[PDB]
Amino acid sequence: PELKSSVPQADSAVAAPEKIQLNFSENLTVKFSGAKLTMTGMKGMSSHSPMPVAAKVAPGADPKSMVIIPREPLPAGTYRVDWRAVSSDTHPITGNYTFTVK
Amino acid sequence: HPELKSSVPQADSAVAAPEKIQLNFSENLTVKFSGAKLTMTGMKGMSSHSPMPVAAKVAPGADPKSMVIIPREPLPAGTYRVDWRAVSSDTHPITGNYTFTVK
Secondary structure: OOEEEEEOOOOOEEOOOOOEEEEEOOOOOHHHOEEEEEEEEOOOOOOOOOEEEOEEEEEOOOOOEEEEEEOOOOOOEEEEEEEEEOOOOOOOEEEEEEEEEO | OOOEEEEEOOOOOEEOOOOOEEEEEOOOOOHHHOEEEEEEEEOOOOOOOOOEEEOEEEEEOOOOOEEEEEEOOOOOOEEEEEEEEEOOOOOOOEEEEEEEEEO
């Protein structure tokens, strides 16, 4: 299980996304996978108070992907995506990346 | 920087469901920059590969060197992991984690 790509792309600066797409190299065992979203920075906020962002995860149209749908608006700021992917091998793989909302 | 001196439930202990989780540190906490999360990593009847986040709220302790985690849901018998973030006046985050079981 390896992350092939993501939308938003890592280290990118884009308009608030309607959803976050994570595309992996193998078919996901979604019941054992997951992801979380955190707002690590925002104008007017301290640099030491990261805010978790409520979100829901759903299986993608492509079985090698999953999508994160935020349950709250995404203010301009910096975000971190933490993910956990598991395939038929049943061996958890984790990773993370950051992107900015402008 | 703050160091975890003790906790209730204690690390690697088996206890009756706690009403709250108390984290005691060596230095006064800057609670606004601190925090913690609770995850149910195991439960009889559930898969071994599907950790479940447990909603909770964090409040400052009576003792300025402590903070309390109050779960927003019941805690069924099972295994739990506490992840914490503690910051003192030095303003440097220190993180750690420990596990305990509810029986």
